[PDB]
Short mmCIF file of C-alpha atoms and ligand atoms in Angstrom, two decimals:
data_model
loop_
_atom_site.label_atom_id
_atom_site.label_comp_id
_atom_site.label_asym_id
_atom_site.label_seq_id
_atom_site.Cartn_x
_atom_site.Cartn_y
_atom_site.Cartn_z
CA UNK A 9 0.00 0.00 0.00
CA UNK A 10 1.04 3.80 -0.64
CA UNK A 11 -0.20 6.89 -0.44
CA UNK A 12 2.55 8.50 -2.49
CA UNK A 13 1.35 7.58 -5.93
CA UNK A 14 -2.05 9.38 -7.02
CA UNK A 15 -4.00 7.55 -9.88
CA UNK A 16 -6.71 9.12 -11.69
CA UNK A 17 -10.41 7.21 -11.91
CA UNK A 18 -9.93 3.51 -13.48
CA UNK A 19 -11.83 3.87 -16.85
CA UNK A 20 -9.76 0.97 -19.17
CA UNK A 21 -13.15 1.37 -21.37
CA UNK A 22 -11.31 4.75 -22.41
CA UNK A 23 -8.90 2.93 -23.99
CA UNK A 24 -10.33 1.61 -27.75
CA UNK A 25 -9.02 0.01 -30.97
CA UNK A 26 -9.84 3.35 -32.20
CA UNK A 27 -7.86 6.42 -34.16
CA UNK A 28 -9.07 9.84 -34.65
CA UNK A 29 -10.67 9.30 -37.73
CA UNK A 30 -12.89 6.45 -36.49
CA UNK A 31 -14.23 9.25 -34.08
CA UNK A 32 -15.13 11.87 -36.74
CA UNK A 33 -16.38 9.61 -39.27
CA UNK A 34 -18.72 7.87 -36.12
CA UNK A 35 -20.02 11.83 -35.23
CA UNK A 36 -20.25 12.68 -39.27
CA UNK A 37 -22.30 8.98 -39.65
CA UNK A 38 -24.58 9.90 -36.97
CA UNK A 39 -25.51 13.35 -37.34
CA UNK A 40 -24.67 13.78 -40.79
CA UNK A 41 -27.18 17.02 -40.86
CA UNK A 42 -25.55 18.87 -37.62
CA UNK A 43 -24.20 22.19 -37.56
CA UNK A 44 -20.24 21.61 -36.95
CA UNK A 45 -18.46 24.84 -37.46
CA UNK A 46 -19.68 28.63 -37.84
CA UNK A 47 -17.22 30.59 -39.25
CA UNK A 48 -19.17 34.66 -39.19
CA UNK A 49 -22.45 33.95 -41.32
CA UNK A 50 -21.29 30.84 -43.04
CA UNK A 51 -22.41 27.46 -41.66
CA UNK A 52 -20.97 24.14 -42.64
CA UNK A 53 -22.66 20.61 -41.70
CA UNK A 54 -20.86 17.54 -40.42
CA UNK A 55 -22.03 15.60 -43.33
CA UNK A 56 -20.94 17.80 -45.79
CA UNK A 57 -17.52 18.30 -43.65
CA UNK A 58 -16.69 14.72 -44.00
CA UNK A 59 -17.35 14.72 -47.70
CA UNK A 60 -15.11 17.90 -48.17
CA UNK A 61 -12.52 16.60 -46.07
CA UNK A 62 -12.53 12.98 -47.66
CA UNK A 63 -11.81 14.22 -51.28
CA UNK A 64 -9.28 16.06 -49.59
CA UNK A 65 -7.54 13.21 -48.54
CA UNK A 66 -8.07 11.47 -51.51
CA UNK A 67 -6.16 13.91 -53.33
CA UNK A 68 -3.44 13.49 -50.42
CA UNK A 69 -3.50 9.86 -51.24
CA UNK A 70 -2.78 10.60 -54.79
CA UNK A 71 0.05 12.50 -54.05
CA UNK A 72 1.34 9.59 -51.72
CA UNK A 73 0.40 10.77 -48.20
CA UNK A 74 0.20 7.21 -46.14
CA UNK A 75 -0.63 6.50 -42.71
CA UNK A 76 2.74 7.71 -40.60
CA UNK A 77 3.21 10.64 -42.61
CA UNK A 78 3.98 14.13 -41.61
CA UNK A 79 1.86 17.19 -43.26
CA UNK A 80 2.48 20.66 -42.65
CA UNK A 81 -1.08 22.65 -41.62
CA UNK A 82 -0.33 26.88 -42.19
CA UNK A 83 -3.59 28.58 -42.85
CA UNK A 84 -5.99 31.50 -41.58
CA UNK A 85 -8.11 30.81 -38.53
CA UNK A 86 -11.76 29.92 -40.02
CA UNK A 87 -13.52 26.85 -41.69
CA UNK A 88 -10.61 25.84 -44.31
CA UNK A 89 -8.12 25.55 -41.83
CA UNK A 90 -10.18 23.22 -39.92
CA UNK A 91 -11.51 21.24 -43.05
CA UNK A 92 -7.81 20.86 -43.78
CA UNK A 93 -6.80 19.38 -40.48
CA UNK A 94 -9.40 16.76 -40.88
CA UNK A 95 -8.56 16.18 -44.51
CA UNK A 96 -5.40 15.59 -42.94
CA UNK A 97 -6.35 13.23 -40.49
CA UNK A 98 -8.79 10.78 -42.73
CA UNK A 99 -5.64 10.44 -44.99
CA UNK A 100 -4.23 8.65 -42.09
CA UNK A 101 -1.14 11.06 -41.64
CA UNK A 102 -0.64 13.14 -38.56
CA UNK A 103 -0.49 17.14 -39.27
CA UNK A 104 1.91 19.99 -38.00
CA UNK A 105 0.56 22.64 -37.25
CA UNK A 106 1.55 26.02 -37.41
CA UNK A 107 0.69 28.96 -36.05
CA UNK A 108 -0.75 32.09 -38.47
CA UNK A 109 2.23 34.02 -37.43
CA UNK A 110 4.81 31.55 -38.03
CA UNK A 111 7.78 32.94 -40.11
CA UNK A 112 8.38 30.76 -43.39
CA UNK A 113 11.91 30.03 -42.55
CA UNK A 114 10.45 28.68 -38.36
CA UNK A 115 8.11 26.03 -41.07
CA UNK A 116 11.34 25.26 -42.91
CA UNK A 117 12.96 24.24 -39.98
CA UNK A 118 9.92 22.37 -38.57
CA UNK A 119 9.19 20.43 -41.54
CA UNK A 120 12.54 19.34 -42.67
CA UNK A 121 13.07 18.26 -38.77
CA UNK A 122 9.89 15.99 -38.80
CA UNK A 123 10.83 15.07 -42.19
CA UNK A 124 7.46 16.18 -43.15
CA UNK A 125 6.06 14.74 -46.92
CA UNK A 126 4.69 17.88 -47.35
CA UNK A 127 2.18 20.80 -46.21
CA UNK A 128 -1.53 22.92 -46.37
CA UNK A 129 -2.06 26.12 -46.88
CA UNK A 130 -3.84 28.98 -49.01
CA UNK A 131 -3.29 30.44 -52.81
CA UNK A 132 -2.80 33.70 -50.83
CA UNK A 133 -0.08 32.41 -48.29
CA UNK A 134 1.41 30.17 -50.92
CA UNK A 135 3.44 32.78 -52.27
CA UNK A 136 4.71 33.43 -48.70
CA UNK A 137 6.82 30.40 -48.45
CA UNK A 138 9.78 30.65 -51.26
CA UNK A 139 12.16 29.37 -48.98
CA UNK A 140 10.18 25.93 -47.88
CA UNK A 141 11.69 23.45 -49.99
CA UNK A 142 9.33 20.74 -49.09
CA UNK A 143 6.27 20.27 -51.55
CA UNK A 144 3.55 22.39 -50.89
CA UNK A 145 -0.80 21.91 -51.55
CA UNK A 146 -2.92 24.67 -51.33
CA UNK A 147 -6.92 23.64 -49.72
CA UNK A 148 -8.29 24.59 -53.04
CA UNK A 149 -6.14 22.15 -55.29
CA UNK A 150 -7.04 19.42 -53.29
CA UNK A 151 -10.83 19.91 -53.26
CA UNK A 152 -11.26 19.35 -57.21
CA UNK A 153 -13.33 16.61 -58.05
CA UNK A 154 -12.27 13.56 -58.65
CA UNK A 155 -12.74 10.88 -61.49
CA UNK A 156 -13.10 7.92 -58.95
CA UNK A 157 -12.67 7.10 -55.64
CA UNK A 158 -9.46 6.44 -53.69
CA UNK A 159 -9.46 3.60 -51.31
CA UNK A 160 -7.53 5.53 -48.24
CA UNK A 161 -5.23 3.08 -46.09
CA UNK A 162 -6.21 2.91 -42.23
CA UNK A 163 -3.90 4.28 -39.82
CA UNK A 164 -3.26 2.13 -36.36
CA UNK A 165 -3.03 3.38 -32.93
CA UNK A 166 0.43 3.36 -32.66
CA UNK A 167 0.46 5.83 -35.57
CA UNK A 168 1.31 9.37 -34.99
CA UNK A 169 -1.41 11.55 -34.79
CA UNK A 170 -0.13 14.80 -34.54
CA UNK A 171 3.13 16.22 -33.80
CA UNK A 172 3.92 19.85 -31.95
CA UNK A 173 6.15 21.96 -31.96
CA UNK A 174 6.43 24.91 -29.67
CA UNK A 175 5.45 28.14 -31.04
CA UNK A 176 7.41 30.66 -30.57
CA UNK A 177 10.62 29.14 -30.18
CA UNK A 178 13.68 30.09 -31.84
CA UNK A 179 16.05 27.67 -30.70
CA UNK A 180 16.66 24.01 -31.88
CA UNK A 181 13.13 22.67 -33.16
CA UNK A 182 11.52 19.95 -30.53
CA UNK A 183 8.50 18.19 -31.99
CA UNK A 184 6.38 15.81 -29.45
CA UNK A 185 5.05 13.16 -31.28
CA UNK A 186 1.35 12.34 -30.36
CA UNK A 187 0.15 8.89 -31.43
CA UNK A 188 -3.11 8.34 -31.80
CA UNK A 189 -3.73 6.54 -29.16
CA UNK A 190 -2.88 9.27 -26.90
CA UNK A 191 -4.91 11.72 -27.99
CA UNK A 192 -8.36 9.39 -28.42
CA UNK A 193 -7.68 8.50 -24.43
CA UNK A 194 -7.13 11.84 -23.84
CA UNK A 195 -10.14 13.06 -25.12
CA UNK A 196 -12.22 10.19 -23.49
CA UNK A 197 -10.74 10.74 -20.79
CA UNK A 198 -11.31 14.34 -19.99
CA UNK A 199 -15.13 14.61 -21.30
CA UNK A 200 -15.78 12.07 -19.04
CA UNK A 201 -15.46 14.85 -16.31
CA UNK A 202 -16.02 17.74 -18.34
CA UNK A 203 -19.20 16.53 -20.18
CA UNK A 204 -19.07 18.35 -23.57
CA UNK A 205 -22.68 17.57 -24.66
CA UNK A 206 -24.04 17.45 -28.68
CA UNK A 207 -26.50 20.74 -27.84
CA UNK A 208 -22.98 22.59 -26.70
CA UNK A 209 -22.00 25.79 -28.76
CA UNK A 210 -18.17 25.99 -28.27
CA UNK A 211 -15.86 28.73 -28.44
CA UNK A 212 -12.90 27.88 -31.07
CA UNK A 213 -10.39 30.81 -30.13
CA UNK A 214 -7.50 28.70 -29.94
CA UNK A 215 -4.57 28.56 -32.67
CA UNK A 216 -4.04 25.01 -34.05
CA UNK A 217 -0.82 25.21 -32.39
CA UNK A 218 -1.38 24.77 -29.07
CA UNK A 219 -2.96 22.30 -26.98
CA UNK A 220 -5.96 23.63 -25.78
CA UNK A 221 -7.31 24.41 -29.48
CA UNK A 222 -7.86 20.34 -29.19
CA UNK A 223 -10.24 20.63 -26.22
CA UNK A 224 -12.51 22.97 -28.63
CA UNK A 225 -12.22 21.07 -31.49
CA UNK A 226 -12.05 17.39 -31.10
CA UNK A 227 -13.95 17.04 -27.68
CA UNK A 228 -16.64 19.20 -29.57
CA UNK A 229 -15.86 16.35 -32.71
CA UNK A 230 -16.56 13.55 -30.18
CA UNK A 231 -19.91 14.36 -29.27
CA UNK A 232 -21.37 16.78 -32.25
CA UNK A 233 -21.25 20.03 -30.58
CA UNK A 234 -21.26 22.77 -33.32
CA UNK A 235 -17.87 25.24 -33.32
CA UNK A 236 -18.13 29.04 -33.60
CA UNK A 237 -14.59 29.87 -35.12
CA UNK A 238 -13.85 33.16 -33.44
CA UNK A 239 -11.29 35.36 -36.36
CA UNK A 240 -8.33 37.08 -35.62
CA UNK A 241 -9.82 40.51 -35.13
CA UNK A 242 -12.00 39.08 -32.09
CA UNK A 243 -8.96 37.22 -30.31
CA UNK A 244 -7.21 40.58 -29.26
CA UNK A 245 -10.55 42.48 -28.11
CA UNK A 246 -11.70 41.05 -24.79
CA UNK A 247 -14.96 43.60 -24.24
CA UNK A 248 -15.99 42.89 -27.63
CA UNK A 249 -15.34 38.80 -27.61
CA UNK A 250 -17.10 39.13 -23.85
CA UNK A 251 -20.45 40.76 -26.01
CA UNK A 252 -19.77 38.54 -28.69
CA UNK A 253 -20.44 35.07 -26.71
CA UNK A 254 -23.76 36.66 -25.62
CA UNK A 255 -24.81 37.27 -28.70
CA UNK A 256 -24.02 33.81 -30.24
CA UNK A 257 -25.17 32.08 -27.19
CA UNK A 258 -22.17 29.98 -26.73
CA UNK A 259 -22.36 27.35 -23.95
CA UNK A 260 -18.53 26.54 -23.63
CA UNK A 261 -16.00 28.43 -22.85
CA UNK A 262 -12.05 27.28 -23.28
CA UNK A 263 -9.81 29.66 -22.44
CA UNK A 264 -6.69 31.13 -19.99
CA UNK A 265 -7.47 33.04 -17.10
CA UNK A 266 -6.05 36.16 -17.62
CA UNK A 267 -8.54 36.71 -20.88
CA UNK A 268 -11.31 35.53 -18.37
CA UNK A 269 -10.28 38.63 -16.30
CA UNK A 270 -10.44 40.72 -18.82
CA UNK A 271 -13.98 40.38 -19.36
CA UNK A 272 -16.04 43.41 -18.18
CA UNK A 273 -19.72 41.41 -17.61
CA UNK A 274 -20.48 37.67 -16.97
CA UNK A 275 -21.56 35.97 -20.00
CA UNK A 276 -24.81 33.97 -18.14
CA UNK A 277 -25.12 31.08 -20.33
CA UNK A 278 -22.26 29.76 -20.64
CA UNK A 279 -22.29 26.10 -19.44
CA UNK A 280 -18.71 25.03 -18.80
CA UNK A 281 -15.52 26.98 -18.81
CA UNK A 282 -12.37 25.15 -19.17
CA UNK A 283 -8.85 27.39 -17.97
CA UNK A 284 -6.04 26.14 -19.31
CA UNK A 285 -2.54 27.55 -19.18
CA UNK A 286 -2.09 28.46 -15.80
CA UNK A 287 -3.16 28.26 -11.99
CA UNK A 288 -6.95 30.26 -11.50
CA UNK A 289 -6.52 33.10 -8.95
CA UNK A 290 -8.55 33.16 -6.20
CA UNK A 291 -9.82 36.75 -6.92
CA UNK A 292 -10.83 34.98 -10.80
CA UNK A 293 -12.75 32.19 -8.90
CA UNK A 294 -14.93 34.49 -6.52
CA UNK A 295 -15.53 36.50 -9.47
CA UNK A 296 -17.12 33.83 -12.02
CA UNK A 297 -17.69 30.34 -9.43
CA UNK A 298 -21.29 30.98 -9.87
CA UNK A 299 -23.61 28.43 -9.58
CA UNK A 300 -24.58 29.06 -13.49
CA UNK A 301 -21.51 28.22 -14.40
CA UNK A 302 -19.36 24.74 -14.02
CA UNK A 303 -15.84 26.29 -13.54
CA UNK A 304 -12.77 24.06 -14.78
CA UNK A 305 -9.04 24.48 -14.12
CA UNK A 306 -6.54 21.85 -16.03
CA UNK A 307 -3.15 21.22 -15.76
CA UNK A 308 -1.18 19.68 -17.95
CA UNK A 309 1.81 19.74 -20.49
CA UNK A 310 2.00 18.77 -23.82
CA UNK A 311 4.18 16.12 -23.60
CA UNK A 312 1.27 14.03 -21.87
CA UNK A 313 -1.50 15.54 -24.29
CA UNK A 314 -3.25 18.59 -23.93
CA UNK A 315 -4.00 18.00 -20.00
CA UNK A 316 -3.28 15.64 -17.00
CA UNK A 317 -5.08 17.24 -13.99
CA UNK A 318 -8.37 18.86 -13.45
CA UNK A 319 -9.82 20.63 -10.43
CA UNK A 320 -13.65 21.57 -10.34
CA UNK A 321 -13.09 25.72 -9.09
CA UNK A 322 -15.68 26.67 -6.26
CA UNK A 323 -15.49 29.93 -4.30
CA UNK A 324 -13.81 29.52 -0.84
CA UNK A 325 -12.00 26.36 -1.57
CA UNK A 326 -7.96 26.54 -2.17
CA UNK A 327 -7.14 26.14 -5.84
CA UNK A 328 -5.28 23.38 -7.23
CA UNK A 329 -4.33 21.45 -10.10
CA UNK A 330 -6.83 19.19 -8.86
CA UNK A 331 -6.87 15.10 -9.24
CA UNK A 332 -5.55 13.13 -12.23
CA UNK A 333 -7.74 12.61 -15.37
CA UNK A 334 -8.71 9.08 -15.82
CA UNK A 335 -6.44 6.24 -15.62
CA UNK A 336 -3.54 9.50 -15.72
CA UNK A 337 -1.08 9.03 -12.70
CA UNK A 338 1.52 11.23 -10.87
CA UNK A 339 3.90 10.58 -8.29
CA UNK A 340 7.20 12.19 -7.00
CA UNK A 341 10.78 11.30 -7.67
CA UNK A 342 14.31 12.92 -7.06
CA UNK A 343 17.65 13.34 -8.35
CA UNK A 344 18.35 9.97 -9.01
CA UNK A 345 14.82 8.61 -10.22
CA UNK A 346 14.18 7.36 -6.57
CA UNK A 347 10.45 7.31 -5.42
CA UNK A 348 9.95 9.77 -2.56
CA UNK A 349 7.34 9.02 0.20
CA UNK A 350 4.30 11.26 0.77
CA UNK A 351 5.79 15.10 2.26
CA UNK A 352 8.62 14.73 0.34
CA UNK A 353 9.50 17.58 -2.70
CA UNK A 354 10.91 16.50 -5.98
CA UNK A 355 10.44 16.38 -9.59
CA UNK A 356 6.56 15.27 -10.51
CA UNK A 357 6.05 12.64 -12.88
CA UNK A 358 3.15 11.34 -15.35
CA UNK A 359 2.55 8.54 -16.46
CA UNK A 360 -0.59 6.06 -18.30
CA UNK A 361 -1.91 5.22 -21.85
CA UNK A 362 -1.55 9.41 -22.81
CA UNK A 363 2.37 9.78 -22.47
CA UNK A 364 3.69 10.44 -25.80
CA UNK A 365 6.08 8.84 -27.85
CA UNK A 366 8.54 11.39 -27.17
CA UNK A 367 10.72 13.90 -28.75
CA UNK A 368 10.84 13.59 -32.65
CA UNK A 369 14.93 12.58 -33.72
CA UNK A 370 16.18 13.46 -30.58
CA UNK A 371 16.66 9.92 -28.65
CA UNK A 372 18.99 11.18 -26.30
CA UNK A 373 16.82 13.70 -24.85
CA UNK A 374 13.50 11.67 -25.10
CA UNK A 375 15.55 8.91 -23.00
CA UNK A 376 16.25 11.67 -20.13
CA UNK A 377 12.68 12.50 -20.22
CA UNK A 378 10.41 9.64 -20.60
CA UNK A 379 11.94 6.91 -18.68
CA UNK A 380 10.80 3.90 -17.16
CA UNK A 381 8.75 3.09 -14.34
CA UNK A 382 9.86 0.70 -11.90
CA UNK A 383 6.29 0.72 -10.44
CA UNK A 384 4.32 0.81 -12.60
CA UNK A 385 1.07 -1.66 -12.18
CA UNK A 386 -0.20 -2.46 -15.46
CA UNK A 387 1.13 -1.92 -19.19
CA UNK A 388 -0.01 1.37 -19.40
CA UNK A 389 2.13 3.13 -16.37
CA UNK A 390 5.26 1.72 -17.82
CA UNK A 391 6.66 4.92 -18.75
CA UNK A 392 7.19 8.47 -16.87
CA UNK A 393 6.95 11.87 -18.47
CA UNK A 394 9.14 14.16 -16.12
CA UNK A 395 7.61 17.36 -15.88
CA UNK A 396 10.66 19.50 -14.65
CA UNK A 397 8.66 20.91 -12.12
CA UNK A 398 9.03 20.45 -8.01
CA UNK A 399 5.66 19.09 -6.18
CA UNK A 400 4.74 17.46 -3.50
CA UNK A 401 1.85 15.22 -2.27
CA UNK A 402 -0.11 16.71 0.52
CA UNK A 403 -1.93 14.89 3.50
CA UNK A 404 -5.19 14.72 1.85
CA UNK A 405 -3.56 13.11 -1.20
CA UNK A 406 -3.31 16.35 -3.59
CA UNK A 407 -0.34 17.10 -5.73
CA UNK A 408 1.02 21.00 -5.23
CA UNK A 409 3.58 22.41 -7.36
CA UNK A 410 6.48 24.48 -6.38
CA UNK A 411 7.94 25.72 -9.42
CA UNK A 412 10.64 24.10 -11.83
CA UNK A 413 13.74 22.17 -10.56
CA UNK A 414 15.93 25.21 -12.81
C1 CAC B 1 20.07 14.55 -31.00
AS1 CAC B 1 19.61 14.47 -29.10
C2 CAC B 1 21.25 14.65 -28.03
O1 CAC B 1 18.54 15.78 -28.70
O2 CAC B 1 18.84 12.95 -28.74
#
């Protein structure tokens, strides 16, 4: 028995012979004539998403994208950029994404590191990328029609599903590959807490380039809820995206905490709000912990996709990172990858079925960082993600961080 290892709720019906595209095509099968993405005054159905997005990968397939394959994502926030992450994804590849304000020769680097087949992007932004040697398809070439149909080759859970790279970074490139595996858990995992329902309206304010831009799309993909892409006017203007979420009537709310603080008025009808990012302040919780609203706070880095703790925010009580997701696990370790009893500080690790593969072409590095697990109790703990970051386990079982170990 211990009480220094914390485990997350045991859900092993979270893990499925699935991939990503078995989850889409499942929501696109069943509610073909749903509303999945808003984009100002233009509306585009699930049905006729999967469609769009399937000739797109056909014309990937054509080109000889293949399950295991890297492709390059670089286009404006709105429905094409979405359509082309998909069309991505049911070609069995995994994407890249980049952010909008990427520089062309930050892509060159990424791509040639991940040893990418190829990338997305506009006519308009095409011209933009002279230096990318890699071959480039715009959206609009790859949604000609077709003579026939092209039988597109399944993709397995081991598979990569996506791999990121930290935007913003202008030092050596560091992509985390995400198999597919991974991210299907993950997203079981956390709706079965947060409870992302098919009448949701969700928020999609997130670039494709960082994690949280998953919990708006794909939860939303896993249970039909329809996606109101915000554009890039709206993300600087807190007031007017506070207004605009009335307006729309959107139900879900992803999001950091300092734009939560930056809204002047509550927003009533907004269901669920997920902060991301960074700790809640207390002053944040006993300003929107209302009982209208279901108040998140997740924890989490990348490297064990999108999130690995989530705390339920209420006015008066202490925030924390909260408890595990499902079948997620932390515990404690020090210098020499020795497991500390409960009180103890040192380095907090993750482990469970959402670690990732590691660091793309750097083996060295992924060995310091994902390592093994000496007690781990099933197949699924076998490896630890170590976060960098000092914790310890209090006497009523909770993790608390105390910033990194540099
Ligand atoms: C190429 As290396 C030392 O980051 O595994």
């Amino acid at each position: 028995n211990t009480k220094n290892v914390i485990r997350g709720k045991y859900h092993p019906e979270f893990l499925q012979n699935e991939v990503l595209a078995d989850i889409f095509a499942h929501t696109a099968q069943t509610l073909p004539d749903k509303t999945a993405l808003i984009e100002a005054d233009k509306t585009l159905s699930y049905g006729e998403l999967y469609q769009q997005a399937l000739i797109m990968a056909q014309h990937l397939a054509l080109k000889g994208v293949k399950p295991g394959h890297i492709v390059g994502l670089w286009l404006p926030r709105g429905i094409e950029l979405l359509k082309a992450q998909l069309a991505i994804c049911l070609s069995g590849a995994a994407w890249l994404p980049f952010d909008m304000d990427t520089p062309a020769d930050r892509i060159a680097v990424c791509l040639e590191d991940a040893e990418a087949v190829g990338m997305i992007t506009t006519d308009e932004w095409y011209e933009h990328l002279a230096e990318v040697p890699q071959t480039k398809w715009t959206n609009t070439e790859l949604q000609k029609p077709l003579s026939e149909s092209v039988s597109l080759a399944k993709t397995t859970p081991d598979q990569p599903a996506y791999i990121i790279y930290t935007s913003g970074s202008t030092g050596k490139p560091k992509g985390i590959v995400i198999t597919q595996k991974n991210i299907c858990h993950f997203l079981r995992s956390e709706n079965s807490i947060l409870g992302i329902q098919e009448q949701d309206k969700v928020y999609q304010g997130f670039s494709v380039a960082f994690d949280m831009s998953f919990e708006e799309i794909w939860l939303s993909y896993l249970v039909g809820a329809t996606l109101w892409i915000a554009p890039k006017s709206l993300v600087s203007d807190p007031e007017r995206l506070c207004q605009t979420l009335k307006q729309e009537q959107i139900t879900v709310l992803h999001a950091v905490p300092t734009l939560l603080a930056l809204f002047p008025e509550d927003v009533p009808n907004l269901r669920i709000i997920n902060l991301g990012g960074e700790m809640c302040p207390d002053s944040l919780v006993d300003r929107w912990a209302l009982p209208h609203h279901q108040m998140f706070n997740t924890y989490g880095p990348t490297e064990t996709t999108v999130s690995a703790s989530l705390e339920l925010l209420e006015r008066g009580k202490p925030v924390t990172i909260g408890k595990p997701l499902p079948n997620y696990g932390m515990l404690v370790i020090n210098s020499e990858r020795e497991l500390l009893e409960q009180g103890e500080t040192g380095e907090l690790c993750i482990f469970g079925p959402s670690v990732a593969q590691g660091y793309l072409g750097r083996p060295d590095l992924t060995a310091d960082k994902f390592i093994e697990n000496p007690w781990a109790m099933s197949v699924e703990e076998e490896l630890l993600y170590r976060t960098g970051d000092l914790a310890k386990i209090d006497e009523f079982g909770q993790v608390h961080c105390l910033g990194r170990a540099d």
